[PDB]
Amino acid sequence: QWQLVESGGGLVQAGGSLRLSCVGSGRAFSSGAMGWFRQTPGQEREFVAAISWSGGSTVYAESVKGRFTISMDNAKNTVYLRMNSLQPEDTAVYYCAAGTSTFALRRSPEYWGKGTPVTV
Amino acid sequence: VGPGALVAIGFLDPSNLETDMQAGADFKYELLWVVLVGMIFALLIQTLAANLGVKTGRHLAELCREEYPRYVNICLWIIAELAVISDDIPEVLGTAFAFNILLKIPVWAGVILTVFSTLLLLGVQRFGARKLEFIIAAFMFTMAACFFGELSYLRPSAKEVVKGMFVPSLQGKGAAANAIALFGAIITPYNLFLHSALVLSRCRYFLIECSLAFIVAFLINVSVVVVAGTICNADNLSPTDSNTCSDLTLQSAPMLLRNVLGRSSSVVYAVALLASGQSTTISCTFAGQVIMQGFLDMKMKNWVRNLITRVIAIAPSLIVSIVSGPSGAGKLIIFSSMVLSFEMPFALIPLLKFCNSSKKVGPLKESIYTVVIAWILSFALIVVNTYFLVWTYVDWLVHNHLPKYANALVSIVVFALMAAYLVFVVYLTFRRDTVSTY
Ligand SMILES: CCCCCCCCCCCC(=O)OC[C@H](COP(=O)(O)OCC[N+](C)(C)C)OC(=O)CCCCCCCCCCC
């Protein structure tokens, strides 16, 4: 079947270092961009990170930069986001998303994900 | 007093606008280098073509027919006809979009009106000769002024622009698709068949003028890419702006110039698009006539050839517009540019081979450095095309195809077609077909 499945996060205290893995199957996502988005309890979805197939394209959100390291394993077709130096403001539900390029995914992600709650 | 050129007009087709808007809206200033390389390629090849004429007095078509057998020449003519049709699909779609923006009629109405108005445009072209030149110069000036003002208002990051323009990176399959589309829309292989003809009539200053025209065209193209990239991406956008940037057809461009035109950009942009499309059709009519009169010597009236090309182009463009709206037309423009890039090698390899071959070109020979650079670029283009094709097909096959009974048949058909394409390129490349001379 075709789907994207975020996995990880759970709950941490601070400097969580949480290492979220998004696994996508059935549509070959690991050819454009595979990024993330976040949404607080009451709010609109926001950009968190992105990465292209080439490997170096990560465009981050000005709210959080230099704390999230995003890596992509093309062969397994997976996107890993490492959060370090976590803070209460980052509590939110995180949604994996896949697009056609690391900038188009910035605006309209073609494919979404159920998401997981990350609480500090 | 302006010594303008028609090459920039051919570089400012609606296909170029659509490919540039897509590259800017999908990769910010990432594919700018393709505009820099492509133009540098597109100029260089043109020079060779022109030089060929000066050294031979015959178009590339005549030499291609003479030095090749019946079946190779027929396949080359089919490739050239497909190239001309693929070029002429964007003109029809560009004019249809202009009519939709102006008269607020559906896209299919635009395509039908363009089919009706091709004859009127041909008659006007016949009547006036300098009026067309002034019209193209004024359109180029309007595009330059509008986009340069928009760029000045935007104020992008120069460091990022340079890093994106001088550091090639096809970061993603979508980037490969848009890079190939840009190469197709800028190289425009069929123009070779036309350009040689321009020297059949009978140069440091001529080269300088050509380079100035190309620098203006390249500046306009870079400005379009940068403006689309900065405005569509920016840092924070309204939901309406994001939704418009997601698809970004040729009729949502007015959103680009809103800063420097103030809600009056619709009419000016529609007029610019219509003028560019019509002028590109006027230029490509001569190329179609030269292809037909060189590959098979079957003399055809310019108006008849133009009508046939416009009808063959409207068939698919009209079908796409009926089935799918402006987004479908944008996809069709990108696909036509991709096909142009894909079949460029067949109309480029004979040119380089004849330039090298002393038999056909005679004692005069082109600079070895330029020929080697053109050969390397052409090989790189072929490799990128094949890599993108294998990439897309493999990704479609691995998980995007449900049925298995027809999977083997589809795979065999695709492999056979790709093998035929590569075998033809190899025949034309690592093989000498020289049974003639000056
Ligand atoms: C010369 C040898 C050619 C032989 C044919 C081999 C290639 C077959 C590829 C299968 C396409 C496919 O399966 O579709 C895959 C992609 C999908 O694109 P999308 O935008 O995401 O739309 C789908 C949107 N989804 C994701 C929501 C469903 O299609 C393309 O991107 C366009 C492919 C253009 C390839 C160039 C065609 C020109 C070839 C002829 C040149 C002379």
Coordinates of C-alpha atoms and ligand atoms in Angstrom, one line a residue:
Chain A
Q1 CA 0.0 0.0 0.0
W2 CA 0.9 3.7 -0.5
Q3 CA 1.3 5.8 2.6
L4 CA 3.6 7.9 4.8
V5 CA 4.0 6.9 8.4
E6 CA 5.6 9.2 10.9
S7 CA 7.2 7.3 13.8
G8 CA 8.9 8.6 17.0
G9 CA 8.7 11.8 19.0
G10 CA 6.7 10.7 22.0
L11 CA 7.5 13.1 24.8
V12 CA 10.7 14.6 26.1
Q13 CA 11.8 17.3 28.6
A14 CA 14.3 19.7 27.0
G15 CA 17.1 19.4 24.4
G16 CA 14.9 16.4 23.5
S17 CA 17.2 15.3 20.6
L18 CA 14.2 13.4 19.4
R19 CA 14.9 11.6 16.1
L20 CA 11.6 11.3 14.1
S21 CA 11.5 8.9 11.2
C22 CA 9.0 9.2 8.3
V23 CA 8.7 6.1 6.1
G24 CA 7.0 6.4 2.8
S25 CA 6.0 3.5 0.5
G26 CA 3.9 2.9 -2.6
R27 CA 4.6 6.1 -4.4
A28 CA 8.4 6.6 -4.4
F29 CA 8.5 9.8 -2.4
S30 CA 12.3 9.9 -2.2
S31 CA 12.8 11.7 -5.5
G32 CA 11.6 15.2 -4.9
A33 CA 11.4 16.5 -1.3
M34 CA 10.4 14.9 1.9
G35 CA 9.9 17.4 4.7
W36 CA 8.0 18.1 7.9
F37 CA 5.3 20.4 9.2
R38 CA 4.1 21.2 12.7
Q39 CA 0.8 22.3 14.3
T40 CA 0.3 23.4 17.8
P41 CA -2.9 22.4 19.6
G42 CA -4.8 25.5 18.3
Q43 CA -3.0 26.9 15.3
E44 CA -2.3 26.6 11.5
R45 CA 0.2 24.1 10.1
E46 CA 3.7 25.6 9.7
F47 CA 7.0 24.7 8.0
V48 CA 9.5 22.8 10.0
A49 CA 12.1 21.5 7.5
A50 CA 12.6 20.0 4.1
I51 CA 15.2 18.1 2.1
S52 CA 15.6 17.2 -1.6
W53 CA 16.8 13.9 -3.2
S54 CA 20.2 15.4 -4.0
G55 CA 20.8 15.5 -0.3
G56 CA 21.9 19.1 0.3
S57 CA 18.8 21.3 0.0
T58 CA 17.4 21.6 3.5
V59 CA 15.4 24.8 3.8
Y60 CA 14.3 25.4 7.4
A61 CA 11.8 27.6 9.2
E62 CA 13.1 30.9 10.6
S63 CA 11.4 30.0 13.9
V64 CA 13.7 27.0 14.3
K65 CA 17.0 26.8 12.5
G66 CA 20.3 25.2 13.5
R67 CA 18.5 22.9 16.0
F68 CA 16.8 20.5 13.6
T69 CA 19.0 18.4 11.3
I70 CA 17.1 16.7 8.5
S71 CA 18.6 13.7 6.6
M72 CA 17.1 11.6 3.8
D73 CA 17.8 7.9 3.0
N74 CA 16.9 7.5 -0.6
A75 CA 17.3 3.7 -0.9
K76 CA 15.0 3.0 2.1
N77 CA 13.0 6.1 1.1
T78 CA 12.8 7.7 4.5
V79 CA 13.2 11.2 6.0
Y80 CA 14.8 11.6 9.5
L81 CA 14.5 14.8 11.5
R82 CA 16.7 15.2 14.6
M83 CA 15.5 17.8 17.1
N84 CA 18.1 19.1 19.6
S85 CA 17.8 21.8 22.2
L86 CA 14.1 21.3 22.4
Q87 CA 11.8 23.9 24.0
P88 CA 8.2 24.2 25.3
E89 CA 7.3 26.3 22.2
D90 CA 7.9 23.2 20.0
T91 CA 5.1 21.1 21.6
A92 CA 2.9 20.2 18.6
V93 CA 1.7 17.5 16.3
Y94 CA 4.2 16.8 13.5
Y95 CA 3.2 15.8 10.0
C96 CA 5.5 14.2 7.5
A97 CA 4.9 15.5 3.9
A98 CA 6.3 14.8 0.5
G99 CA 6.3 17.0 -2.6
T100 CA 7.9 17.6 -6.0
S101 CA 10.7 19.8 -4.9
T102 CA 12.1 21.1 -1.6
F103 CA 10.4 24.5 -2.3
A104 CA 7.0 23.3 -3.6
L105 CA 6.8 21.1 -0.5
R106 CA 7.2 24.4 1.3
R107 CA 3.8 25.5 0.2
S108 CA 1.6 22.7 -1.1
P109 CA 2.7 19.2 -0.1
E110 CA 1.3 16.7 -2.6
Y111 CA 1.1 13.9 0.0
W112 CA 0.5 14.3 3.7
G113 CA 0.8 12.1 6.8
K114 CA -1.2 11.4 10.0
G115 CA 1.4 12.9 12.2
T116 CA 2.6 12.2 15.8
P117 CA 2.4 14.3 19.0
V118 CA 5.7 15.7 20.4
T119 CA 5.2 17.1 23.9
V120 CA 7.9 18.6 26.1
Chain B
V1 CA 17.6 54.0 -33.2
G2 CA 17.7 50.4 -31.9
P3 CA 19.5 47.6 -33.6
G4 CA 17.3 44.9 -32.2
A5 CA 17.3 41.2 -33.1
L6 CA 14.7 38.4 -33.6
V7 CA 16.7 35.8 -31.6
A8 CA 15.6 37.3 -28.3
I9 CA 12.0 37.1 -29.5
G10 CA 12.5 33.4 -30.1
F11 CA 14.0 33.2 -26.6
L12 CA 10.9 34.9 -25.1
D13 CA 8.1 32.5 -26.2
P14 CA 5.3 31.6 -23.9
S15 CA 7.2 28.3 -23.5
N16 CA 10.1 30.2 -22.1
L17 CA 7.9 32.2 -19.7
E18 CA 6.2 29.0 -18.5
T19 CA 9.4 27.1 -18.0
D20 CA 11.0 30.1 -16.2
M21 CA 8.0 30.6 -14.0
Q22 CA 7.9 26.9 -13.0
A23 CA 11.7 26.9 -12.3
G24 CA 11.4 30.0 -10.1
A25 CA 8.3 28.8 -8.3
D26 CA 9.7 25.3 -7.6
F27 CA 13.4 25.8 -7.0
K28 CA 13.9 29.6 -6.3
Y29 CA 17.3 30.5 -7.8
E30 CA 18.4 26.9 -8.2
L31 CA 18.0 26.3 -12.0
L32 CA 19.4 29.8 -12.9
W33 CA 22.6 28.0 -14.1
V34 CA 20.5 26.1 -16.7
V35 CA 19.5 29.5 -18.1
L36 CA 23.2 30.5 -18.0
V37 CA 24.5 27.2 -19.6
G38 CA 21.5 26.8 -21.9
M39 CA 21.9 30.3 -23.3
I40 CA 25.7 29.8 -23.6
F41 CA 24.9 26.6 -25.4
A42 CA 22.1 28.2 -27.4
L43 CA 24.3 30.9 -28.7
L44 CA 27.3 28.7 -29.4
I45 CA 25.3 26.2 -31.5
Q46 CA 23.7 29.1 -33.4
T47 CA 27.1 30.5 -34.2
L48 CA 28.2 27.1 -35.6
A49 CA 25.0 26.9 -37.7
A50 CA 25.5 30.4 -39.1
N51 CA 29.2 29.6 -39.8
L52 CA 28.2 26.4 -41.5
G53 CA 26.2 28.5 -44.0
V54 CA 29.1 30.9 -44.6
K55 CA 31.3 27.9 -45.3
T56 CA 28.9 26.0 -47.4
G57 CA 26.1 28.2 -48.7
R58 CA 23.5 25.4 -48.0
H59 CA 21.3 24.9 -45.0
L60 CA 21.8 22.1 -42.5
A61 CA 18.8 20.4 -44.0
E62 CA 20.4 20.0 -47.5
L63 CA 23.6 18.6 -46.1
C64 CA 21.7 16.2 -43.8
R65 CA 19.7 14.9 -46.7
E66 CA 22.7 14.6 -49.0
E67 CA 25.1 12.8 -46.7
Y68 CA 22.6 10.4 -45.3
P69 CA 20.5 7.6 -46.8
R70 CA 16.8 7.7 -47.6
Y71 CA 15.6 6.2 -44.3
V72 CA 17.9 8.2 -42.1
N73 CA 16.9 11.4 -43.9
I74 CA 13.2 10.5 -43.6
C75 CA 13.6 9.9 -39.9
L76 CA 15.4 13.2 -39.5
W77 CA 12.6 14.9 -41.3
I78 CA 10.0 13.3 -39.0
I79 CA 12.1 14.5 -36.0
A80 CA 12.2 18.0 -37.4
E81 CA 8.5 18.0 -38.0
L82 CA 7.9 16.8 -34.4
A83 CA 10.2 19.6 -33.2
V84 CA 8.3 22.3 -35.1
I85 CA 5.0 21.0 -33.9
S86 CA 6.3 20.9 -30.3
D87 CA 7.5 24.4 -30.6
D88 CA 4.2 25.5 -32.1
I89 CA 2.1 24.0 -29.3
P90 CA 3.3 26.7 -26.8
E91 CA 2.5 29.5 -29.2
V92 CA -1.1 28.3 -29.5
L93 CA -1.4 27.9 -25.8
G94 CA 0.3 31.2 -25.1
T95 CA -2.1 33.1 -27.4
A96 CA -5.1 31.2 -26.0
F97 CA -4.1 32.2 -22.5
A98 CA -3.7 35.8 -23.6
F99 CA -7.2 35.7 -25.1
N100 CA -8.6 34.2 -21.9
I101 CA -7.0 36.9 -19.8
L102 CA -8.2 39.7 -22.1
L103 CA -11.7 38.7 -23.3
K104 CA -12.5 36.5 -20.3
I105 CA -13.3 33.5 -22.5
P106 CA -12.3 29.9 -21.8
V107 CA -9.0 28.6 -22.9
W108 CA -10.4 26.5 -25.7
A109 CA -11.9 29.7 -27.0
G110 CA -8.4 31.1 -27.0
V111 CA -7.1 28.2 -29.0
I112 CA -9.9 28.4 -31.6
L113 CA -9.4 32.2 -31.9
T114 CA -5.7 31.7 -32.5
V115 CA -6.5 29.2 -35.2
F116 CA -8.8 31.7 -36.8
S117 CA -6.3 34.6 -36.4
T118 CA -3.2 32.8 -37.7
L119 CA -4.2 33.8 -41.2
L120 CA -4.7 37.5 -40.2
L121 CA -1.3 37.5 -38.5
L122 CA 0.3 36.0 -41.7
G123 CA -1.4 38.7 -43.8
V124 CA -0.2 41.5 -41.5
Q125 CA 3.3 40.0 -41.6
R126 CA 3.2 40.0 -45.4
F127 CA 2.0 43.6 -45.5
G128 CA 4.5 45.2 -43.1
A129 CA 8.1 44.3 -42.4
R130 CA 9.5 47.0 -40.2
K131 CA 6.3 47.3 -38.2
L132 CA 6.9 43.8 -36.9
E133 CA 10.4 44.7 -35.9
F134 CA 9.2 47.7 -34.0
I135 CA 6.5 45.6 -32.4
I136 CA 9.0 43.0 -31.2
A137 CA 11.4 45.7 -29.9
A138 CA 8.5 47.4 -28.0
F139 CA 7.4 44.1 -26.5
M140 CA 10.9 43.3 -25.4
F141 CA 11.2 46.7 -23.9
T142 CA 7.9 46.3 -22.0
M143 CA 8.9 42.9 -20.7
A144 CA 12.3 44.2 -19.6
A145 CA 10.9 47.3 -17.9
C146 CA 8.1 45.4 -16.1
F147 CA 10.3 42.6 -14.8
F148 CA 13.2 44.8 -13.9
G149 CA 11.0 47.2 -12.0
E150 CA 9.4 44.1 -10.2
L151 CA 12.9 42.9 -9.4
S152 CA 13.9 46.2 -8.0
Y153 CA 10.9 46.3 -5.8
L154 CA 11.5 42.8 -4.7
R155 CA 15.2 43.1 -3.7
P156 CA 16.2 39.5 -3.5
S157 CA 19.4 38.1 -1.8
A158 CA 22.3 38.6 -4.2
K159 CA 24.4 36.0 -2.4
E160 CA 21.8 33.3 -2.8
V161 CA 21.2 34.2 -6.5
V162 CA 24.9 33.8 -7.3
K163 CA 25.2 30.6 -5.3
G164 CA 22.3 29.2 -7.2
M165 CA 23.4 30.4 -10.6
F166 CA 27.1 29.4 -10.5
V167 CA 26.7 26.1 -8.6
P168 CA 24.7 23.6 -10.7
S169 CA 22.6 21.1 -8.7
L170 CA 19.6 19.1 -10.0
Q171 CA 18.4 18.5 -6.4
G172 CA 15.5 16.3 -7.2
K173 CA 13.6 14.5 -10.0
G174 CA 11.4 17.6 -10.4
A175 CA 14.5 19.7 -10.8
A176 CA 15.7 17.4 -13.5
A177 CA 12.4 17.7 -15.3
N178 CA 12.5 21.5 -15.1
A179 CA 16.1 21.7 -16.1
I180 CA 15.4 19.6 -19.2
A181 CA 12.3 21.7 -19.9
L182 CA 14.5 24.9 -19.7
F183 CA 17.1 23.3 -22.0
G184 CA 14.4 22.5 -24.5
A185 CA 12.8 25.9 -24.4
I186 CA 16.2 27.7 -24.7
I187 CA 18.2 25.5 -27.1
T188 CA 15.2 25.0 -29.4
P189 CA 17.0 22.6 -31.9
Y190 CA 14.7 23.2 -34.8
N191 CA 15.9 26.8 -35.1
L192 CA 19.2 25.4 -36.4
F193 CA 17.4 24.4 -39.6
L194 CA 16.0 27.9 -39.8
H195 CA 19.2 29.8 -38.8
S196 CA 21.4 28.3 -41.5
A197 CA 18.8 29.6 -44.0
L198 CA 19.4 33.1 -42.7
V199 CA 22.9 32.9 -44.1
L200 CA 21.9 31.4 -47.5
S201 CA 21.3 34.9 -48.8
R202 CA 25.1 35.7 -49.0
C203 CA 31.8 39.2 -38.9
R204 CA 33.0 40.7 -35.6
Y205 CA 30.3 43.4 -35.5
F206 CA 27.6 40.9 -36.4
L207 CA 28.8 38.6 -33.6
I208 CA 28.9 41.5 -31.2
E209 CA 25.3 42.4 -32.1
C210 CA 24.2 38.8 -31.7
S211 CA 25.9 38.7 -28.3
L212 CA 24.2 41.9 -27.2
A213 CA 20.8 40.4 -28.2
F214 CA 21.6 37.2 -26.4
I215 CA 22.7 39.1 -23.3
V216 CA 19.4 41.1 -23.3
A217 CA 17.4 37.8 -23.7
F218 CA 19.4 36.1 -20.9
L219 CA 19.0 39.1 -18.6
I220 CA 15.2 39.0 -19.2
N221 CA 15.1 35.2 -18.6
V222 CA 17.1 35.5 -15.4
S223 CA 14.9 38.4 -14.3
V224 CA 11.8 36.2 -14.8
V225 CA 13.3 33.3 -12.9
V226 CA 14.4 35.5 -10.0
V227 CA 11.1 37.4 -9.8
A228 CA 9.0 34.2 -9.8
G229 CA 11.3 32.6 -7.3
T230 CA 11.3 35.5 -4.9
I231 CA 7.6 36.4 -5.0
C232 CA 6.3 32.9 -5.0
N233 CA 8.6 31.8 -2.1
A234 CA 9.4 34.9 -0.2
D235 CA 9.0 34.2 3.6
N236 CA 5.3 34.7 4.4
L237 CA 2.4 34.6 1.8
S238 CA -1.3 34.9 1.9
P239 CA -3.2 31.7 1.4
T240 CA -4.5 33.0 -2.0
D241 CA -0.9 33.7 -3.1
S242 CA 0.2 30.2 -2.1
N243 CA -2.7 28.6 -3.9
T244 CA -1.9 30.6 -7.0
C245 CA 1.8 29.8 -6.8
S246 CA 1.2 26.1 -6.4
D247 CA -0.1 25.7 -10.0
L248 CA 1.1 29.0 -11.6
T249 CA -0.2 28.7 -15.2
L250 CA 0.5 31.3 -17.9
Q251 CA -2.6 33.2 -16.8
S252 CA -1.6 33.6 -13.2
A253 CA 1.5 35.5 -14.1
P254 CA -0.3 38.9 -13.5
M255 CA 0.3 38.1 -9.9
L256 CA 4.1 38.5 -10.6
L257 CA 3.9 42.1 -11.9
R258 CA 1.4 43.4 -9.4
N259 CA 4.1 45.2 -7.4
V260 CA 5.3 47.3 -10.4
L261 CA 2.0 47.7 -12.2
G262 CA -0.7 48.1 -9.4
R263 CA -3.6 45.9 -10.3
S264 CA -3.3 47.1 -14.0
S265 CA -0.9 44.4 -14.9
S266 CA -3.5 42.1 -16.4
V267 CA -4.0 44.0 -19.7
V268 CA -0.3 44.8 -20.1
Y269 CA 0.8 41.2 -19.4
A270 CA -1.9 39.8 -21.7
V271 CA -0.7 42.1 -24.5
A272 CA 2.9 41.2 -23.9
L273 CA 2.0 37.5 -24.1
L274 CA 0.0 37.8 -27.2
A275 CA 2.7 39.8 -29.0
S276 CA 5.4 37.3 -28.0
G277 CA 3.3 34.3 -29.1
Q278 CA 2.4 35.8 -32.5
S279 CA 6.0 36.9 -33.2
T280 CA 7.3 33.4 -32.3
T281 CA 4.8 31.9 -34.8
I282 CA 6.0 34.3 -37.4
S283 CA 9.6 33.4 -36.9
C284 CA 8.9 29.6 -36.8
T285 CA 7.0 29.7 -40.1
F286 CA 10.3 30.3 -41.9
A287 CA 11.9 27.4 -40.0
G288 CA 9.1 25.1 -41.0
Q289 CA 9.3 26.2 -44.6
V290 CA 13.1 25.6 -44.6
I291 CA 12.8 22.2 -43.1
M292 CA 10.2 21.1 -45.6
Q293 CA 12.1 22.6 -48.6
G294 CA 15.4 21.1 -47.5
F295 CA 14.8 17.6 -46.1
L296 CA 12.6 16.5 -49.1
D297 CA 12.6 19.5 -51.5
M298 CA 8.8 19.4 -51.5
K299 CA 8.1 23.1 -52.0
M300 CA 5.3 24.3 -49.7
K301 CA 3.7 27.7 -49.4
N302 CA 4.5 29.4 -46.2
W303 CA 0.8 30.0 -45.3
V304 CA -0.1 26.4 -46.1
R305 CA 2.8 25.1 -43.9
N306 CA 1.8 27.5 -41.1
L307 CA -1.9 26.4 -41.3
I308 CA -0.9 22.7 -41.1
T309 CA 1.4 23.3 -38.2
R310 CA -1.2 25.4 -36.3
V311 CA -3.9 22.8 -36.9
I312 CA -1.7 19.9 -35.8
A313 CA -0.7 21.9 -32.7
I314 CA -4.3 22.9 -31.8
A315 CA -5.4 19.3 -31.9
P316 CA -3.5 18.3 -28.8
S317 CA -3.6 21.8 -27.2
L318 CA -7.3 22.0 -27.7
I319 CA -7.9 18.5 -26.4
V320 CA -5.8 19.2 -23.3
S321 CA -7.6 22.5 -22.7
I322 CA -11.0 20.8 -23.0
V323 CA -10.1 17.9 -20.8
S324 CA -8.0 20.0 -18.4
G325 CA -8.0 23.7 -17.6
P326 CA -5.1 26.2 -17.6
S327 CA -3.1 23.9 -15.3
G328 CA -3.3 21.2 -18.0
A329 CA -2.2 23.8 -20.6
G330 CA 0.8 24.6 -18.4
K331 CA 1.7 20.9 -18.2
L332 CA 1.4 20.7 -21.9
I333 CA 3.8 23.6 -22.4
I334 CA 6.3 22.0 -20.1
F335 CA 5.9 18.7 -21.9
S336 CA 6.4 20.3 -25.3
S337 CA 9.6 22.0 -24.1
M338 CA 10.7 18.6 -22.8
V339 CA 10.1 16.9 -26.1
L340 CA 12.1 19.7 -27.8
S341 CA 15.0 19.0 -25.5
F342 CA 14.7 15.3 -26.0
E343 CA 14.9 15.4 -29.8
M344 CA 17.5 18.2 -30.0
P345 CA 20.4 15.7 -30.4
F346 CA 19.1 14.5 -33.7
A347 CA 19.2 18.0 -35.2
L348 CA 22.4 18.9 -33.4
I349 CA 24.7 15.9 -34.0
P350 CA 24.6 16.3 -37.8
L351 CA 25.6 20.0 -37.4
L352 CA 28.7 19.2 -35.3
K353 CA 29.6 16.3 -37.5
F354 CA 29.4 18.4 -40.7
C355 CA 31.4 21.2 -39.0
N356 CA 34.2 18.8 -38.2
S357 CA 34.1 16.9 -41.4
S358 CA 36.5 18.5 -43.8
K359 CA 34.9 16.9 -46.8
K360 CA 31.6 18.6 -46.4
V361 CA 32.9 21.9 -45.0
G362 CA 36.0 21.9 -47.3
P363 CA 39.3 23.4 -46.3
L364 CA 37.7 25.9 -43.9
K365 CA 37.2 24.4 -40.4
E366 CA 35.6 25.7 -37.3
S367 CA 37.6 26.3 -34.2
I368 CA 38.4 23.0 -32.6
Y369 CA 37.7 24.4 -29.1
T370 CA 34.1 25.4 -29.9
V371 CA 33.4 22.1 -31.6
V372 CA 34.8 20.2 -28.6
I373 CA 32.8 22.3 -26.2
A374 CA 29.6 21.8 -28.2
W375 CA 30.3 18.0 -28.4
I376 CA 30.7 17.8 -24.6
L377 CA 27.6 19.8 -23.9
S378 CA 25.6 17.8 -26.4
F379 CA 26.8 14.5 -24.8
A380 CA 25.9 15.9 -21.3
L381 CA 22.5 16.8 -22.5
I382 CA 21.9 13.4 -24.0
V383 CA 23.0 11.7 -20.8
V384 CA 20.8 13.9 -18.6
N385 CA 17.8 13.2 -20.9
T386 CA 18.4 9.4 -20.7
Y387 CA 19.0 9.6 -16.9
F388 CA 15.7 11.5 -16.4
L389 CA 13.8 9.1 -18.6
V390 CA 15.1 6.0 -16.9
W391 CA 14.5 7.6 -13.5
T392 CA 10.9 8.5 -14.2
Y393 CA 10.1 5.1 -15.8
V394 CA 11.7 3.1 -13.0
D395 CA 9.9 5.1 -10.3
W396 CA 6.6 4.6 -12.2
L397 CA 7.3 0.9 -12.6
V398 CA 8.5 0.1 -9.1
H399 CA 5.4 1.0 -7.2
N400 CA 3.1 3.3 -9.3
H401 CA 1.8 0.5 -11.5
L402 CA -0.7 -1.9 -10.1
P403 CA -1.3 -4.4 -12.9
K404 CA 1.3 -7.0 -13.6
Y405 CA 0.0 -8.8 -16.7
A406 CA 0.8 -5.8 -18.9
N407 CA 3.9 -4.7 -16.9
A408 CA 6.2 -7.0 -18.9
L409 CA 4.8 -5.7 -22.2
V410 CA 5.1 -2.1 -21.2
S411 CA 8.6 -2.6 -19.9
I412 CA 9.6 -4.3 -23.2
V413 CA 8.0 -1.6 -25.3
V414 CA 9.7 1.2 -23.3
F415 CA 13.1 -0.6 -23.4
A416 CA 12.8 -1.1 -27.1
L417 CA 12.0 2.6 -27.7
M418 CA 14.9 3.8 -25.5
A419 CA 17.3 1.3 -27.1
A420 CA 16.2 2.6 -30.6
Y421 CA 16.8 6.2 -29.5
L422 CA 20.2 5.4 -28.0
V423 CA 21.1 3.3 -31.1
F424 CA 20.2 6.2 -33.4
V425 CA 22.2 8.7 -31.4
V426 CA 25.2 6.3 -31.4
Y427 CA 24.9 5.7 -35.2
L428 CA 24.9 9.5 -35.7
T429 CA 27.7 10.1 -33.2
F430 CA 30.3 7.3 -33.5
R431 CA 29.9 6.7 -37.2
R432 CA 30.9 8.6 -40.3
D433 CA 28.3 9.0 -43.1
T434 CA 30.3 11.0 -45.7
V435 CA 29.7 10.3 -49.3
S436 CA 29.7 14.0 -50.5
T437 CA 31.8 17.1 -50.3
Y438 CA 31.7 20.9 -50.9
Ligands
LIG1 C1 12.3 8.4 -26.3 C2 11.9 7.3 -25.4 C3 10.6 7.6 -24.7 C4 10.0 6.3 -24.2 C5 9.0 6.5 -23.1 C6 9.7 6.3 -21.7 C7 9.2 7.3 -20.6 C8 7.9 6.9 -20.0 C9 7.7 7.6 -18.7 C10 6.4 7.3 -18.0 C11 5.7 8.5 -17.5 C12 4.9 8.2 -16.2 O1 4.7 7.1 -15.9 O2 4.4 9.3 -15.4 C13 5.2 9.7 -14.3 C14 5.5 11.2 -14.3 C15 4.5 11.8 -13.3 O3 4.5 13.2 -13.4 P1 3.5 14.2 -12.5 O4 3.6 15.6 -12.8 O5 3.8 13.9 -11.0 O6 1.9 13.7 -12.8 C16 1.3 12.7 -12.1 C17 0.7 13.3 -10.8 N1 0.5 12.2 -9.7 C18 1.8 12.0 -9.1 C19 -0.4 12.8 -8.7 C20 0.0 11.0 -10.2 O7 5.2 11.7 -15.6 C21 6.0 12.8 -15.9 O8 6.5 13.5 -15.1 C22 6.1 13.2 -17.5 C23 7.1 12.3 -18.2 C24 7.7 13.0 -19.4 C25 8.8 12.1 -20.0 C26 9.2 12.6 -21.4 C27 8.2 12.0 -22.5 C28 8.8 12.3 -23.9 C29 9.4 11.0 -24.5 C30 9.6 11.1 -26.0 C31 10.9 11.9 -26.3 C32 11.2 11.7 -27.8

